[PDB]
């Protein structure tokens, strides 16, 4: 009978709990109190981009800190020139139920996927000058929730049918499959060295995956509800999560525990996206009460607020060099700040 | 100006992009956006027939009005995380089968799902059409199987005219938004055009009431 599982599962769970509690000497707050407060930070709308006619669901910064891409519930994918607001390319989609986009590190490829259970790959450097499709990746049985690039020939994908799978764009067949989640999977984020990636799902759990061995290694828990967005801290040895609990958290990849939490009573709605500043000193957490906040990472105090949107914020990103910030929202206006 | 002959052609391109983005953002306001729900019985297929992978979209034209129906029966994943993509639909289209009153486990499930959808925060102002299917088998089963099986508290005679019309009171009493939305019930006369003509007439009521709420006349 399956009763023989209970004892072993209990002992291993208690062993992991005891280890994680024994390695918890002191919190991040205790040693950080000595550094000076950042004070009050003000930013202003140095630019504003217009042209989508519906809600906006994702965005990704280019690699040279000047271009970016965004996709909306209309069948439109558009690349902006962020300096002079010129539109560079506008790409018509197949299925209007869009939820993801990504920019290649070489800035040559762009990817998209939606409710049709398929992820597509586009070629920005043709000899006719117009974007074309090169591959369609099929094999999931749930909505596609995230996607990232390793290089020009390896893309990672994530779906709500509990299965994350690493692919090879050249042939079209997945060359690994990651399993272990019980519910829908919502986000993933690579490592700076491009050998790992973490993910978060509706189970209220986060799992670290070895890209090459194809096997899970570590699990992080502590959120009270579903998890919406995830980001990987710029050193490469931490990441931060955002949930529908109206709370965000910082996790560590070396001592295996939650480090810090950022929560305030005046917010009852849940976080939609999370991203980091270039020194790791700021955390720009978009929210559901129609505006975006700013949190100092080390001390958890909130420096300021960017409030220029008339609806829920859905996607934000910090540039590669550190100049600016961009945010999108369901009101169809992308605003560049600085 | 302070623009070179290069950068002065990188703004004509960005204008010529919008001159084609708008011409195709207004073409998408001439179509009617209808959702569909219910159990996956045979009713759906016949309904699509008489109107002539993860999402299936059907289109049909009738009296110069184009509808598009997003049958979401192919997803089978957690509903709370993709339902809001369908905000701003014109009208829902429900589906119910009469014959399943005794199989009364099926009836309670349909009632529970009707209750669950109606009070969503994303669907406060959407008009719910409701169809009713399998009258032919219902009238033959009721002649031997009493309605007391599904509803023991039925104090009525259980005659055919007094039986089939008892369900609608229980269906349309579930609405908690009487002042904003209304059920437009029907009996599926599968042999004639009244299946789709009823939808055509039932859409204009809410179109007009929404116009009369926008201009302020209400």
């Amino acid at each position: 009978e399956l009763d023989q599982l209970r004892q072993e599962a209990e002992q291993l769970k208690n062993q992991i709990r005891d280890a994680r509690k024994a390695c918890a000497d002191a919190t991040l707050s205790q040693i950080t109190n000595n550094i000076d407060p950042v004070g009050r930070i003000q930013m202003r709308t140095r630019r504003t981009l217009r042209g989508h006619l519906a809600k906006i669901y994702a965005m990704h910064w280019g690699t040279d800190s000047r271009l970016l891409v965004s996709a909306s519930q209309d069948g439109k994918l558009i690349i902006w020139d962020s300096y002079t607001t010129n539109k560079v390319h506008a790409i018509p989609l197949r299925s209007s139920w869009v939820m993801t986009c990504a920019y290649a590190p070489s800035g040559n490829y762009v990817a998209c996927g939606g409710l049709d259970n398929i992820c597509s790959i586009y070629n920005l450097k043709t000899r006719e000058g117009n974007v074309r499709v090169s591959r369609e990746l099929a094999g999931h049985t749930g909505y596609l929730s995230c996607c990232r690039f390793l290089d020009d020939n390896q893309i990672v994908t994530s779906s709500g049918d509990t299965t994350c799978a690493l692919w090879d764009i050249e042939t079209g067949q997945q060359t690994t499959t990651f399993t272990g989640h019980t519910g829908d999977v919502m986000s993933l984020s690579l490592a700076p060295d491009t050998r790992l990636f973490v993910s978060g799902a509706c189970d209220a759990s986060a799992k670290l995956w070895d890209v090459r061995e194809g096997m899970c290694r570590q699990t992080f828990t502590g959120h009270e509800s579903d998890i919406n967005a995830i980001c990987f801290f710029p050193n490469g040895n931490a990441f931060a999560t955002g949930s529908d609990d109206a709370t965000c958290r910082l996790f560590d990849l070396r001592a295996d525990q939650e480090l810090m939490t950022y929560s305030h009573d005046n917010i009852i709605c849940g976080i939609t996206s999370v991203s980091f500043s270039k020194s790791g000193r700021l955390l720009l957490a978009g929210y559901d009460d129609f505006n975006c906040n700013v949190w100092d990472a080390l001390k958890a105090d909130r420096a300021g607020v960017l409030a220029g949107h008339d609806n829920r914020v859905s996607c934000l990103g910090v540039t590669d060099d550190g100049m600016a910030v961009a945010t999108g929202s369901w009101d169809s206006f992308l605003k560049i700040w600085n | 100006c302070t623009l070179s002959a290069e950068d002065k052609a990188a703004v004509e391109r960005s204008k010529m992009i919008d001159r084609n983005l708008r011409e195709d953002g207004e073409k998408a306001a001439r179509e009617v956006k209808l959702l569909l729900l219910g159990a996956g019985e045979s009713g759906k297929s016949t309904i699509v027939k008489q109107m002539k992978t993860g999402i299936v979209e059907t289109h049909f034209t009738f009296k110069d009005l184009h509808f598009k129906m997003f049958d979401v029966g192919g997803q089978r994943s957690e509903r709370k995380k993709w339902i809001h993509c369908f905000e701003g639909v014109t009208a829902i289209i429900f589906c119910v089968a009469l014959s399943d009153y005794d199989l009364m486990n099926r009836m309670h499930e349909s009632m529970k799902l009707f209750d669950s959808i109606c009070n969503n925060k994303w669907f406060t102002d959407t008009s719910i059409i409701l169809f009713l299917n399998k009258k032919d088998l219902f009238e033959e089963k009721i002649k031997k199987s009493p309605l007391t099986i599904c509803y023991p508290e039925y104090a009525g005679s259980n005659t055919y005219e007094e039986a089939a019309a008892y369900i609608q009171c229980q269906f349309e009493d579930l609405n908690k938004r009487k002042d904003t939305k209304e059920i437009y019930t029907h009996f599926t006369c599968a042999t004639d055009t009244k299946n789709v003509q009823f939808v055509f007439d039932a859409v204009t009521d809410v179109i007009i009431k929404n116009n009369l709420k926008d201009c302020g006349l209400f």
Partner: single-chain antibody
Amino acid sequence: VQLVESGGGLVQPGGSRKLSCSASGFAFSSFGMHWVRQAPEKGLEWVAYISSGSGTIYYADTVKGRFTISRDDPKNTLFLQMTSLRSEDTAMYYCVRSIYYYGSSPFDFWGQGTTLTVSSSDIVMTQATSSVPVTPGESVSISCRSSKSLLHSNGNTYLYWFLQRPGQSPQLLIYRMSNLASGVPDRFSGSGSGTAFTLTISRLEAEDVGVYYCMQHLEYPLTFGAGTKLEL
């Protein structure tokens, strides 16, 4: 990708004619188009322009009131209509696509060109070298000079280096000073500052023999230097 054009022939001076180019695939409906020229045994010259969507149209100081340009966007056909020709217009015409958006590479495909022979305030550029002989394997350098600065507030240096191997139409090498064109062997490069610029070829090969040109594109008028020639 192809550009093909036809027409030309013998023309009585003062007459009228037309030249047209056909694009194969190539999405001719999205590219700003020029028509660049060169006289027999002279440097490259410039004629006309037509932007995307039949809008912006510029002209050279000599062609302003004699020729008209137009694109048949549906059928992907480009025209130039000629009136009142004289002896000064006998030359070759080279349809040249271009792509103006951030990060692009203008002037990156010449058509095959067409012969036309008649019957019988601008930034100046100069380059003094001509027919210099060098043995292969050794490094070489070429330089042309500008009458005014080409660097800009935006930082781009609007100088081009093209190559015309004998018998062939030009092909882009250096679309801006620090940037080269794809499909070209890596051995070429370029450097320069202020109002003086110099080209370098690292490892001279058999096919590098040909004439070169340099172009300024800082503001509208488009001026070409003389034709330097390398020799084996």
